[PDB]
Amino acid sequence: CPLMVKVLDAVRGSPAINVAVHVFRKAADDTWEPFASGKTSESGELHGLTTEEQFVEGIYKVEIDTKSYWKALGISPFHEHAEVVFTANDSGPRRYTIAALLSPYSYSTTAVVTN
Template sequence: MASSRLFLLCLAGLVFVSEASPVGSGEPKCPLMVKVLDVVQGIPAVNVGVKVFKKAADENWEPFASGKTSEFGELHGLTTDEKLVEGIYKVELDTKSYWKSLGFSPFHEYAEVVTAESGHRHYTIMALLSPCTYSTTALISGPKEC
């Protein structure tokens, strides 16, 4: 039984990952996208607060960008190629507020991903959320359209 649940969770994640934005439409490039799925309901996680921080020379985290996920559980347009320079970045998802708004008592305050940017690569950060656990993964590629 547990293995079939794990299989379904993995399958949901694959479907979630496969819904990439179209390439070649002439739109501005989107070097950082966030996608969030609520695995309890099996739907996109809407209005999840997202904050991006950049590590400063003094080792403190400085605010870099923020927003909320759309009705599709996605957040585009956080930054541009010009602004996403070499450095260490942290993406923080406000999971506590999301779950509290649905009447759950969550275990985590937030979910975070810390990564180093070392070139002009583009990132899609994906998160699968439940009240007591989360899983993240990243697709790293060349430029994608927003």
Template sequence: KDHHLPFLQHKISLFLLQNPFDAKHPLYVKVVDSVRGSPAPNVPVKLYKEAADGSWELLNSKQTNEKGGLPELTTKEQFVAGLYKLELDTASYWKSLGLNPFHHHADV
């Protein structure tokens, strides 16, 4: 088993969408394994909001579902105007596939 795959094979795509199915949870995160062309399940995702002092406040932490989706990461009340950051734990996803990760997390 070759664990030294090119960078291209360690690619995850992230889609941020307005959730049309659930007004209580306005943000929908979708993580896709771009190499395999399939959803990336069980990817730990953390949502942060920038605080007034410039630090990052953790709002929530969950894992993507079997379809690579994360529909309930924040609520309408929490999701106010501001600067947000998502942190995807890509290392755990690649390790679950038996691959050595190129990077340990991706921030968006």
């Protein structure tokens, strides 16, 4: 399993749980096509995602629905959503982890890439 996501809440100092996360593979027409989606688990993680064989070289975009996460705590968010576009390249494609640490007006993001 090469693609995991994690969401933290820097307001509660907990995992963000039930964050809708939608992945998109860029299509030839340089058009964003749905690839996989799921809801963050108990611990703020999502390993659903993909198959080693299905995750091929390309432009991928992880889109996190944060506004929703914020609204639901009855906090007013600045962002519409968080998104991260990266290239699944590297040597040949490996194991990614896309962490997002959130706040109403600020979010961070990181990739932890390991072989």
